[PDB]
Design a protein around this ligand. Sequence first.
Ligand SMILES: Nc1ncnc2c1ncn2[C@@H]1O[C@H](COP(=O)(O)O)[C@@H](O)[C@H]1O
Ligand SMILES: Nc1ncnc2c1ncn2[C@@H]1O[C@H](COP(=O)(O)O)[C@@H](O)[C@H]1O
Lengths: 335, 335
Amino acid sequence: PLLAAPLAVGDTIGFFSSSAPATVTAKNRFFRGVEFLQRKGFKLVSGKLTGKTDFYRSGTIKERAQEFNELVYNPDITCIMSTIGGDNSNSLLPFLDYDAIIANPKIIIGYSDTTALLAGIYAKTGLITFYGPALIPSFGEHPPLVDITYESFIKILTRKQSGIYTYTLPEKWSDESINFNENKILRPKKLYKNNCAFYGSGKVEGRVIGGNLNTLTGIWGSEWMPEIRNGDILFIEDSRKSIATVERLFSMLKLNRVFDKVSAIILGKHELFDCAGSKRRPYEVLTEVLDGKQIPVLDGFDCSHTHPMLTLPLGVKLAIDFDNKNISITEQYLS
Amino acid sequence: PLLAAPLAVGDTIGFFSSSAPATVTAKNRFFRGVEFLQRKGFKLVSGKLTGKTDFYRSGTIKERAQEFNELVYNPDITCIMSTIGGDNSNSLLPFLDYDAIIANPKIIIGYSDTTALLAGIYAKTGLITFYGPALIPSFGEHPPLVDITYESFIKILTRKQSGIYTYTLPEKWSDESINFNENKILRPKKLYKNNCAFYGSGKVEGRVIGGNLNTLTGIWGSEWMPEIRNGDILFIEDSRKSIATVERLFSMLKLNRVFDKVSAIILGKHELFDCAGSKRRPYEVLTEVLDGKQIPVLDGFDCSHTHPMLTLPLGVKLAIDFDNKNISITEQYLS
Ligand SMILES: Nc1ncnc2c1ncn2[C@@H]1O[C@H](COP(=O)(O)O)[C@@H](O)[C@H]1O
Ligand SMILES: Nc1ncnc2c1ncn2[C@@H]1O[C@H](COP(=O)(O)O)[C@@H](O)[C@H]1O
């Protein structure tokens, strides 16, 4: 695989808005995120579409591609971070400078709609990119949850590449939709005990592939969708979806023979899942779709739209130990 | 192509609910549709899931496949008609009796989510299926618009298969979200002059392929997605979507090289399109995505979620005359 250099405290992080113009619509939270990372000692470079709006997006398809490419050209930048997702990053894919990425590999990180870029870049270049924090939703989060998000971010990206890395399990989590763009909080978010479940036995090791499943539909079938292979571990998360949408997306995977290939599935915690009164969880829907076929599932991994959020390299081997109830990175993912 | 027997006055129509349980949730409109077709002289066979609910759907994946298959097995049925769409018909595809569909070809008709079945059946069998009326939303519509929908339905499906068929243009249309399941109406829908536009010159003839674009994402990449070939006319429609979603879906097509293949695009009128205050129409978004690629477009064809709705065979040749501003079926589509 193509590997970027590790992050270090004091490095320059560049940020871009490939979809929703949240540097404007969520300016307070944006500023909180900027201040948070600056206090940690990081230098921040703002992408050229910061503070701009084109209604539902930050700018034209071509301008958004340019914003990203300009960060790739900047030799001072070690990490390229999404400000926020949205719906429209897939539009950029024909216009990204993949050859420049090959020449100057960097840490590329984000989630949700940014999946189109993470997966697309991996498909074109083999660069190991990261499912992880975006500046506004992740680092604009209030304490204490933001601290746990940062702890994972810094551990994953700065640690020495020796031996396996076994993930810590967040003690508490939340998906409550309060205190987003408000400067002062009325009360802290409702905290839930971690209900992550390991369905299966033994150990499964394989290349992790995926991201935000709804977003993957925007690149599916194209040269920008990485091929899923026999033995892969499928990582998928979604946010604020109806059970109807979740069934459709799971069946899409089934039709595409994905469940014939993968040796395990990781489901990220689904933020504010709408079960339509059925009281069914996404795992139950997956079980029906699988039609009697047994695939080991890690249900409720803290790498999604819920807080706190862990950082996960995509395109490298993970080992899920279903007996010991843990998950580890087993392949080198930074140079 | 595999062709079904033509419809005739007095024939038996079977209906199925492959997704949303609207025979229950829209019972008034359902009964209106039933009574409408019965007054036209049609005999109706109720699918086994009529009157049933499983929260967001009519029944389990296998129950819904069974409901559909049972209509295929019935020798008295000439037309199999969707009650309504939803989100979940793609789930049925591994379980449909394709051999029986080939042995007993019938008119299969519906729209929206039912695209998954229409396109999937075509991919597997070569049967010419129909983008057209569903029992509840289409035939439960109040006069005057339901009569125009019916006129197209009966003309397309009963006419002699000799010479080209040139579509009529509805004088008025509506997408107003009133008078759906109410038994009594306070006033009629607002009616709009037909603003259909032909962008381009000359005449384009090619096989029509597509349906509901959002729905196609659920079968994309699989053996159930019909291959789009050089020279095809792409037919796409969506309903109640944001401009953000529309950009994502158009870019999905671009990434898949669809715009390198197709000779023309038909955009169905978009029901209650949400432009996010941009005042932009879907054609403008398509124009940006096309990035200079000159493809002639019929913008606003009345085969979508708007009323009235025309009936369109999928998988046969159409001719769009951009100079004379008309559209015709040029290939035999029923036996
Ligand atoms: N106005 C808002 N109020 C509460 N949460 C929001 C708001 N806007 C965005 N979010 C959260 O930010 C995430 C959306 O970011 P993305 O998935 O990148 O589009 C979701 O997890 C939402 O819960
Ligand atoms: N409660 C409702 N009020 C108004 N229109 C509806 C309602 N439910 C469904 N529809 C319409 O029914 C049509 C068919 O739905 P679908 O088959 O899900 O695309 C769409 O054009 C919807 O706008």
